[PDB]
Amino acid sequence: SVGDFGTVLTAMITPFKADGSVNYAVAAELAAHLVDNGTDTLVVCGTTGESPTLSWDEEYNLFVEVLQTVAGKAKVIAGCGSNSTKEAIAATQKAAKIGVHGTLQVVPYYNKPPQAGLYQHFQAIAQACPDLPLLLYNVPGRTGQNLSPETVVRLAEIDNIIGVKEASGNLDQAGEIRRSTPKEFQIYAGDDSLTLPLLAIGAKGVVSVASHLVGNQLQQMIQAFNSGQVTVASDIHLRLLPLFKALFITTNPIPIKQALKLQGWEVGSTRPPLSDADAEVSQKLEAVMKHLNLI
Amino acid sequence: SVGDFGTVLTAMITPFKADGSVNYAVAAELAAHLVDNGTDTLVVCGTTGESPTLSWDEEYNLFVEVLQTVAGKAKVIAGCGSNSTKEAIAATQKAAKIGVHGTLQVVPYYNKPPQAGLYQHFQAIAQACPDLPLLLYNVPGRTGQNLSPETVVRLAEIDNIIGVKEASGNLDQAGEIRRSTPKEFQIYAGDDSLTLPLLAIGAKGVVSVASHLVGNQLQQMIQAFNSGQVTVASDIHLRLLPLFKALFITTNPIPIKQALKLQGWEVGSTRPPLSDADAEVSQKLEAVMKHLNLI
Amino acid sequence: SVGDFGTVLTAMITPFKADGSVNYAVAAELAAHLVDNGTDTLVVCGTTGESPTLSWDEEYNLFVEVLQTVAGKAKVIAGCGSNSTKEAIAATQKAAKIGVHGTLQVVPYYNKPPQAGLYQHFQAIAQACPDLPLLLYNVPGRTGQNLSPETVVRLAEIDNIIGVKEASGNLDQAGEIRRSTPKEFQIYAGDDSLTLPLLAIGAKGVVSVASHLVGNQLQQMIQAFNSGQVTVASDIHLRLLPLFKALFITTNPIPIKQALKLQGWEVGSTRPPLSDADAEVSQKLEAVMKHLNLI
Amino acid sequence: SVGDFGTVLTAMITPFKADGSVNYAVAAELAAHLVDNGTDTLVVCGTTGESPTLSWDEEYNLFVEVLQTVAGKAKVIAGCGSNSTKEAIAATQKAAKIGVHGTLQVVPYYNKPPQAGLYQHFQAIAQACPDLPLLLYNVPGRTGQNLSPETVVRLAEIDNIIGVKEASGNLDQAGEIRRSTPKEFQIYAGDDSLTLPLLAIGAKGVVSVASHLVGNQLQQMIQAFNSGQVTVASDIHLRLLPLFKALFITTNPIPIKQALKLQGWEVGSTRPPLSDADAEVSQKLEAVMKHLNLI
Ligand SMILES: [Mn+2]
Ligand SMILES: [Mn+2]
Ligand SMILES: [Mn+2]
Ligand SMILES: [Mn+2]
Ligand SMILES: [Mn+2]
Ligand SMILES: [Mn+2]
Ligand SMILES: [Mn+2]
Ligand SMILES: [Mn+2]
Ligand SMILES: [Mn+2]
Ligand SMILES: [Mn+2]
Ligand SMILES: [Mn+2]
Ligand SMILES: [Mn+2]
Ligand SMILES: [Mn+2]
Ligand SMILES: [Mn+2]
């Protein structure tokens, strides 16, 4: 129950004002909107939330703003991971005290720890707040290192490590994890275009970007699937597929911020070193969004 | 009706006697076994049947023997592809007179034709026998070239091109094809571990290796899925996954031929330049099969 | 001495008439031109020679045409390899009798033999004509399988296996081969842009495509290097680099045939399934060639 | 003069005491050793120096200690990069007051900025300390993003950007940069196994790990090459290759720290989340070093 975050977890964007500061009021308005339109749980200051370029102070305040906003309607997972174990632990402890319902812990990027060091890293974070759920996040494309299924299988023996956001794109790996972990341990898709395929082999849901725009449709797809209406589910997947691709034509969260802007949200641009969507990206998104009546 | 091959297509091995010659008696006997145990359609002399090392006369003879062995009970698709278009055409013409129900046409290997060349290749084969169904076969890991979804989409406009055996591992690509092709055009998994995830996005089934051993459980998984018993399907998938992986621990069809031998089938070795399963491999296989009660 | 093929080995193109037949007279005129402009040895019916789409009869006749043309000025290596061991042996034997000075033996494409089977394949071909030099050809991008350094090191123990055309793009691998093979065993670059870097770690030269156009400059680069004029060599490399890339903007030998056509050679187009250079490719080549005063 | 760092830049390890704290005494002693044995310039707190897990105060302290230790004898380049541009700028400003001779600026890891974002990132760092040389560092395997040669070429137009540490393994990319940048802009190998091949196409030298152990032999190889003793250079390269590979058998700097320990240096372990060299690894190292007479 403490580990149940639903099926649609949205990695929320971080809106910025024109001066580049965090726009707390927009973040609140976005959080409430999401939670009323398909998001079960908000993942705050993930990758999509531009974590690398935020200060800790801005992260802390975002977690507080969202918790206040979505009190008793949605859970809140805090992006607290790092390629330094000590920094992750520090962040996790601070987030624990303000009331987050879990943390998202990325595999250490850039330094490429071996599996033994990855095991210790996640173990140490788990043990620093043994009652706080911990969601592993494997994204080799960004970190330069994959978390092996054997390592995940071992970490799932720690009671508060309650799942993995699997964004490797490798279904073999996801199935190896699923078949050797308990049911309290959940797999989430980390790519919107893989949600349906991963559901088919036992995943719980998705940590989504697209849910900012079509969260009610993702719910419908997942509920359709779980109730055995497999062709309704596939129809929705195939209909959304062009949007899912458009949302990664350049590095997330550049496209999603442009999409939201096209619907009138004042989310600002991304923060350096991320750069603004070029005209191409914007036009491709527009056409796809128009085709889906999102604008 | 004509492009309907069912859901389990088995890429049958080619058994050899101790002297290396084709064992037509075991071929027949294996074909009859398969078709009584889960296989809807037999794909003869594909990659799994060691097409590259067979003579054209051996392939012709196999087509005749299998077709006659299973006529009335199942269809036969003949592997007739090549990286020479003239050769593929000539093989396809001859298959058609034998009376087979379709051909499997690999993307040209080794020479890496551009998409325009691949389009013209397939079109010319389709046009040489305009009433014989033609199944595309995309396996970039072996050919060194990927068939693009735009190209597949254009090809599906040709009446007798009725599907693709998709062995790229790329589920976005498959989805792209599925959403832009008509329902007469079917997608088949080219990898047994991808059958369930591809089914979830609209694939028809699998061109399988594992069905030599667990055809009935594959039928059960696919039938469970289509009727909405999604957890029954994922249980089967997860239970079989170690077998699926073990069948690719070295290059197919080395493992599957060793798995068959463990069960008592006299299939012989593979032919040079494929070498025999070393002892580690056979031990891995034996353990997984024992655990599944296959020996 | 029997194994010395020089430093520039040119994988000659195969010119076709308008009706698509082999243009023997152009092949002769091209062979003589090459041998007078930097080519030490002609590699006939390689990949660049469109081997996969030629008949054996056309190959045999090309080997004869070239041998007659370049008698006592250049050696001739015959492309005789296959993914069937028996077919390679047959081809090698036939080529041996008409006087070729060696064979180029590609790693079996598409069927992905394990290393043990690759060892036996090349061993068997070597032993079928034990006095005929044999050049291994590793091109994983096209074959789907890499020949391991350990396997190459073992094959170099067979007296007539006198080197490898290394087109994997992996310099570690090339250095591992160099350091554990005798000096009678030579490494050749299989990519024109890697010739200089591979020379630096002990390669002999290149099996070149670009030599059709700048063979005298490649000689100058290699002679410059071997005489210790390293900056002359690097200058030539850097000056040719754009041509080297242009020659692979689409699949070789499509660009090189267009380049030759732009210089007035009547080489025809490629044979299906290879398709003609599109306008883009042609314009890019033109600009690069003009910039180098090749037209 | 100002961008001239010589040819061997050593990415020095950061030694730790048994309690995990930085060992400044060993740092000094190692710095002095290196600079007497082949190292022209020391790169401090790069990837090899475990930058990710050090505090900013530890890095500041290292910069001061090494600079003072080797002042008059060698230059010091400070690792100051980040995937936040504001952080890189602040670290760069502070390095400049310490009196270091340049900064090493990694491409932003994890967040995958588009090229326009990478251009703006680097430009802003360069502009924050316009008189401090800035060395680009491209290592896509760790960052998940490649710095394109067009982008590098534009950046080399900025006065103080004086080179790139190229660890992509892509020799075409390096050549593209070399031919389109002025001679004040230098290319350094980011991989010890690529030093010789990159030198052959116009690189200046290497930012090295192996120089901790064979700095003088690296100097000999590079000096041999530039004076045209090309076979002396390739002999050294080939002799060292097993060492180069062994230093990357698990993630750098795990092996190199174990190699140093085998020689008697008290460098400690790596810091979490990097784990200790298992026994197989240390045995591999020991054998190669024994064979090279390094222990
Ligand atoms: Mn942050
Ligand atoms: Mn943070
Ligand atoms: Mn909405
Ligand atoms: Mn049936
Ligand atoms: Mn055949
Ligand atoms: Mn055939
Ligand atoms: Mn019969
Ligand atoms: Mn041929
Ligand atoms: Mn042939
Ligand atoms: Mn010429
Ligand atoms: Mn010096
Ligand atoms: Mn630090
Ligand atoms: Mn730092
Ligand atoms: Mn001191």
Topology overview:
The structure is a homotetramer of 295-residue chains.
Chain A: E1 8-11, H1 24-36, E2 41-44, H2 56-70, E3 75-79, H3 85-97, E4 102-106, H4 115-128, E5 134-138, H5 140-143, H6 149-155, E6 161-166, H7 171-179, E7 186-189, H8 195-200, E8 205-208, H9 211-226, H10 230-246, H11 254-262, H12 279-291
Parallel strand pairs in A: 1-2, 1-8, 2-3, 3-4, 4-5, 5-6, 6-7, 7-8
Keywords (chains A, B, C, D): Amino-acid biosynthesis, Cytoplasm, Diaminopimelate biosynthesis, Lyase, Lysine biosynthesis, Metal-binding, Schiff base
Function (chains A, B, C, D): Catalyzes the condensation of (S)-aspartate-beta-semialdehyde [(S)-ASA] and pyruvate to 4-hydroxy-tetrahydrodipicolinate (HTPA).
Site (Part of a proton relay during catalysis) (chains A, B, C, D): 47, 110
CATH topology of chain A: TIM Barrel
Total DSSP E strands of chain A:
8
Q: Give helix % range of chain A.
A: 40-55%
What small-molecule ligands were found? manganese (II) ion
Binding site for Mn(2+) 6 (chains A, B, C, D): 65, 68
Active site (chains A, B, C, D): 137 (proton donor/acceptor), 165 (schiff-base intermediate with substrate)
InterPro entries (chains A, B, C, D): Aldolase_TIM, DapA, DapA-like, Schiff_base-form_aldolases_AS
Catalytic activity (chains A, B, C, D): L-aspartate 4-semialdehyde + pyruvate = (2S,4S)-4-hydroxy-2,3,4,5-tetrahydrodipicolinate + H2O + H(+)
